[PDB]
Amino acid sequence: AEIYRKSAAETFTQLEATEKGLTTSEVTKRQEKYGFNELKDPLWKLFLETFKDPMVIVLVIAALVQLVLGEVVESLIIFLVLIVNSIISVVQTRKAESSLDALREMSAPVAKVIRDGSKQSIHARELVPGDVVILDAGDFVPADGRLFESGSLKIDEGMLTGESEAVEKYIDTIPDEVGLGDRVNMVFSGSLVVYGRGMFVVTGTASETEIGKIAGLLETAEAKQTPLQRKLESFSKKLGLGILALCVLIFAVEAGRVLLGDNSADMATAILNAFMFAVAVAVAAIPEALSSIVTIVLAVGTNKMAKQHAIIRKLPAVETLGSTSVICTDKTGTLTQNKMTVVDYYLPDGTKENFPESPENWSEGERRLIHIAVLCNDSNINSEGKELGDPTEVALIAFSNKNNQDYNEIREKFIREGEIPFDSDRKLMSTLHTFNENKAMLTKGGPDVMFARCSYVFLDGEEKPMTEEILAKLKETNEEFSNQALRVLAYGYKRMPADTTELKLEDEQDIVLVGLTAMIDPPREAVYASIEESKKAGIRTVMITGDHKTTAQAIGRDIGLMDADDIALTGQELDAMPEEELDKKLEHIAVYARVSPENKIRIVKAWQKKGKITAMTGDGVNDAPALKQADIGVAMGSGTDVAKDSAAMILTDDNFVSIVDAVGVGRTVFDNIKKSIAYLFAGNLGAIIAILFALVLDWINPFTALQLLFINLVNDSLPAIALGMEKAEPDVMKRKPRDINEGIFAGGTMRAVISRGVLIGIAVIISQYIGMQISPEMSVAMAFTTLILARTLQTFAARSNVQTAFGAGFFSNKYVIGAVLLCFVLYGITVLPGAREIFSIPASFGLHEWSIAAGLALAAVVMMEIIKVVQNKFFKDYDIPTT
Ligand SMILES: CCCCCCCC/C=C\CCCCCCCC(=O)OC[C@H](COP(=O)(O)OCC[N+](C)(C)C)OC(=O)CCCCCCC/C=C\CCCCCCCC
Ligand SMILES: CCCCCCCC/C=C\CCCCCCCC(=O)O[C@H](COC(=O)CCCCCCC/C=C/CCCCCCCC)COP(=O)(O)OCC[N+](C)(C)C
Ligand code: BEF
Ligand SMILES: [Mg+2]
């Protein structure tokens, strides 16, 4: 933090310390100022905040009224569903608290400090600003500080930039302001030293470090409300107000009837009927099993994602994946596989589009290029498949193995007879080999230092290079590779005296050049198709990487996010933009490059500020704040534990196409939830229509609270779940993300609910009337029969809004068939001689009256299918039915 622009001396005078260390008294004094070098809503009376839900208020009042009326067991049943669904909400809030853990067991446990004039190892938590720390290879950087002594020091800063490659450190003052990854004279707590010796003065400990800033970012990330959760809140308020209006109307009708009517009835009988009708409508309108059924449908979605090795922690998260509009992705490790890979090559004697795959189909230039790439390196791959060596060198033996040439056969056939190690100030490596009684020296390295030592080229024979069209073409192709962000290596050999047994450093001149290679961190194979798949779904994909701008533009230009000559925003350029300017430039970036961990969480917050449900995919500590802040965080299975604990879905097999698949799965989840809710309320609406009609005509209440509770809880639970198991619709994933403000009955579902409900109600009204011709008790049995059987049979009509049961496949959904058969068993249980008076079914209720009621239910469901088929064959633009 602006320390890297100062010299070591200025930083020393700022911390009031020298390079010979601190004394014990000064260290104790600074420990009181700074503290030790370490990091550091939920409450179970929230069970009371579950009682702010209107449906809960309605059911609590209905339960108390029934308590007063003497209906105790149905009051107890209501209290059971209340207690249960409340704990269904508490289990959704409690687990999110262990996501607020910030488990940093990756901090360094030891510090190698100079104190009192003596080098000693201390607990790293005891470090303080001004301490002089020594770094050696394999040590973990214990605190942030400014280097003042470096001996070829190289550190892995993959926790801040996402790149596991070691960066070289230098003690020089950085004159200009550069991004966080390019702070060459700064070391950061949490990183791992790879090579060299170092010595730095601590400038930051505890939460005043870059990793401490990451911990603070994780802390501030607060959970969002789910789109389904918002839709259900708004609908619950509407249902509560409506029910309150119906109850006021019930008391109004009862009071006007006793006031402006026949004196026969009592005030007591009228007030009791008013209460019974109000409680009946209250229970009938509320789908008491809704949150439970929704949980089961969500579970089916998360299991379908689990078969693809995508483990979703929270159940509602799968539905949120369906409403995704922006997918922010990290590059290294996420879009790619963090695997250096040969992608292009150049041979002067003919370059092909792709390198051939038969080792015997190759040209002599191709076989010599492969032999030099394999024999001039020390990397290896064992039988298990573990890679050992520099990833640049493992890229070459992986290239040979990819093209059906086992690198081991070449290492076994040509043995190493002498080597020159790779020098830093002489980026070059040579090995000595005997090729069919001819000794040769193989040599490889970067084109800049290799062209200066090449005096021959391998075209047809061994030929001297002319500057025009040979060296100029080589430099043309090298800089063309650099424009595409490719690491280039030049290869060559030298025929050697047959008496040589060792290589000398004076023998690395007049080399015969063979060819060139170009390697990059390539995207995953499924990335191209997934990005196109998400574009068809109305999903914007943004790339947020800590890698360099050139690499981040080359990729992204390759995966279909950037056209040629499109620029990527940098963390340096981003930190200088205020939020208002970023709000106006946010929708026109596609790639951010070389960003800090705070930049990612800032972009994700900005996209959420646009109102978009955002997903963030990542694999490292630099993504963790953005993974926790995002609406849905997806971590790579091969990523760090910090990002996995911060994410909501984890791709165990690193299968990138799972993300888009999750969106597709999520979309069908919500579609099926909509189906189930529409199925549930269509039944409730039919019940309300039957009760209110019985009210305005002064009939007996067609239903009992115990009957309504039994239908809404036991009979209608399996059919709603079965509707939850419905196949994905054909044109899903061709659709745009749903609006968050969209209602839960939007898009023809409201029309479907009212049509099916009115039909069920008319069926119950006619059924109750027919039963009313015998006795009031017979009318209750027939109204209950028609209601429960029309709700059972409606499942066929509720499977789809645009397709009859016979059309989709009458047996295409086997869970619906089993559900209807099981509900028939339920209705049969209600008429068993023991449970008849329980369900208010008189002894005289026979197969004749049952036949009439069941026929009415079946006729109503046939009318639902007829109305649907007329609506979708003749009014198919905006589906609306008539007849
Ligand atoms: C094995 C593979 C199939 C699995 C699925 C189904 C399995 C479930 C079957 C049974 C479960 C146990 C229920 C059995 C006991 C009930 C039968 C019964 O005890 O019956 C006798 C009574 C009355 O007998 P009664 O009138 O002679 O005496 C009248 C004289 N008095 C007035 C003096 C009484 O009857 C009544 O209570 C009327 C009760 C009728 C029960 C029918 C239940 C079927 C449910 C749905 C059918 C689908 C409807 C489709 C539309 C049909 C259009 C017509
Ligand atoms: C079914 C019929 C229902 C009708 C009955 C009506 C009464 C029901 C009332 C309470 C039921 C008690 C069961 C609570 C579940 C355990 C809570 C839990 O386990 O959470 C606690 C979580 O702590 C917290 O974070 C703070 C929240 C504390 C919860 C306090 C709950 C206390 C309940 C008080 C009821 C007050 C009524 C007093 C009446 C006295 C009249 C005689 C347990 O933390 P811990 O320290 O024990 O160990 C933790 C070890 N770790 C974290 C590794 C798992
Ligand atoms: F690993 Be990411 F590209 F920062
Ligand atoms: Mg990464």
The domain that holds 479 is classified in CATH as 3.40.1110.10
Cross-strand pairs, 618: 635
Q: Tell me, in angstroms, the distance from the centre of ligand 2 to residue 46's CA.
A: 12
Using CA atoms, how far apart are residues 107 and 289, in angstroms rounded to an integer?
48
Using CA atoms, how far apart are residues 561 and 543, in angstroms rounded to an integer?
8
Alpha carbon distance, N-terminus to C-terminus of the chain = 74
The label of the residue with tokens 């059309």 reads: 807
- Burial of residue 97 (number of CB atoms within 10 Å: 0-12, 13-18, 19+): exposed
Using CA atoms, how far apart are residues 866 and 878, in angstroms rounded to an integer?
17
- Burial of residue 753 (number of CB atoms within 10 Å: 0-12, 13-18, 19+): buried
Give the position, in ligand 2's atom list, of the atom nearest the Cα of 44: 27
3-state helix, strand, coil in the chain (%, to 5): 50, 15, 35
CA distances from 468 to 46, 479, 480, 491 (A): 80, 16, 17, 20
What backbone phi and psi angles, to 5 degrees, belong to 614?
-110, 140
What tokens appear for 713 in the block?
Answer: 């809880």
Q: Tell me, in angstroms, the distance from the centre of ligand 1 to residue 624's CA.
A: 61
- Burial of residue 408 (number of CB atoms within 10 Å: 0-12, 13-18, 19+): middle
CB-side exposure of 531: number of CA atoms within 13 Å?
20
Using CA atoms, how far apart are residues 132 and 115, in angstroms rounded to an integer?
8
Sign of the C-alpha dihedral, residues 770, 773, 778, 784? positive
**H helix or E strand, kind and range, residue 863:** helix 847-874
Strands (E) in 446-578, as ranges, are 454-458, 462-463, 487-495, 511-520, 540-544, 569-570
User: How is the beta sheet containing 569-570 ordered, strand by strand?
Assistant: 310-312, 649-651, 632-636, 614-618, 326-329, 540-544, 591-593, 569-570
Amino acid at 244: L
Give the Cβ contact number of residue 882 at 10 Å: 8
Do 736 and 832 touch, CB atoms closer than 8 A?
no
Nearest Cα to Cα of residue 235 among 745, 678, 682: 745
Specify the residue with its C-alpha closest to ligand 1, atom 2: 821
- Specify the pairing of strand 166-168 against strand 487-495: unpaired
Nearest Cα to Cα of residue 324 among 597, 589, 529, 535: 535
Three-state DSSP at 831 gives coil
What tokens appear for 872 in the block?
Answer: 């979708």
Nearest Cα to Cα of residue 603 among 873, 326, 385, 806: 326
Using CA atoms, how far apart are residues 245 and 692, in angstroms rounded to an integer?
12
DSSP string, 757-791: HHHHHHHHHHHHHHHHTT-HHHHHHHHHHHHHHHH
Give the Cβ contact number of residue 9 at 10 Å: 12
Please report, for the chain, how many H helices and E strands are present, in that order: 30, 25
Using CA atoms, how far apart are residues 575 and 678, in angstroms rounded to an integer?
48
- To test the pocket of ligand 3, the residue of 214, 547, 636 to mutate (highest count of ligand atoms within 8 Å of its CB) is 547
- Burial of residue 744 (number of CB atoms within 10 Å: 0-12, 13-18, 19+): buried
Using CA atoms, how far apart are residues 105 and 127, in angstroms rounded to an integer?
17
Binding pocket residue ranges, ligand 1, CB within 6 Å: 789, 821, 824-825, 827-828, 831-832, 844-847, 850-851, 854-855, 858
Q: Tell me, in angstroms, the distance from the centre of ligand 1 to residue 136's CA.
A: 85
DSSP string, 9-68: HHHHHHTT-BTTBB-HHHHHHHHHHH--S------GGGGTGGGGSHHHHHHHHHHHHHHH
- Specify the pairing of strand 649-651 against strand 632-636: parallel
Q: Greatest CA span in the chain, whole angstroms? A: 131
Sign of the C-alpha dihedral, residues 56, 58, 59, 61? positive
Specify the residue with its C-alpha closest to ligand 1, atom 45: 824
Cross-strand pairs, 430: 420, 443
Give the position, in ligand 3's atom list, of the atom nearest the Cα of 336: 3
Do 622 and 600 touch, CB atoms closer than 8 A?
yes
Give the position, in ligand 3's atom list, of the atom nearest the Cα of 331: 3
What tokens appear for 835 in the block?
Answer: 């449970």
b/e string for 450-465 if b means 16 or more Cβ within 10 A?
bbebbebbbeeeeeeb
Using CA atoms, how far apart are residues 678 and 671, in angstroms rounded to an integer?
10
**CA R_g for the chain:** 37
What tokens appear for 562 in the block?
Answer: 């950037």
Binding pocket residue ranges, ligand 3, CB within 6 Å: 162, 330-333, 545-547, 620, 622
- To test the pocket of ligand 1, the residue of 786, 822, 824 to mutate (highest count of ligand atoms within 8 Å of its CB) is 824
The label of the residue with tokens 């060299």 reads: 196
What tokens appear for 475 in the block?
Answer: 């430099």
Q: What is the resolution of this structure in A?
A: 3.0
Do 522 and 335 touch, CB atoms closer than 8 A?
no
Sign of the C-alpha dihedral, residues 393, 394, 397, 398? negative
Q: Tell me, in angstroms, the distance from the centre of ligand 2 to residue 68's CA.
A: 30
Q: Tell me, in angstroms, the distance from the centre of ligand 2 to residue 64's CA.
A: 25
What tokens appear for 468 in the block?
Answer: 């025009």
Q: Tell me, in angstroms, the distance from the centre of ligand 2 to residue 86's CA.
A: 15
Q: In Å, how far from its chain's centre is CA 364?
A: 49
Cβ–ligand 2 distance for 45 under 6 Å, the answer: no
Of all ligands present, the nearest one to the C-alpha of 331 is: 3
Q: In Å, how far from its chain's centre is CA 341?
A: 27
* Residue 654 φ/ψ region, left for φ over 0, alpha for ψ in the -120 to 50 degree band, beta for the rest: left
Nearest Cα to Cα of residue 551 among 586, 590, 589, 594: 594
Give the structural domain span for 511. 341-520
Do 69 and 275 touch, CB atoms closer than 8 A?
yes
The residues annotated with a catalytic role in the active site are 330
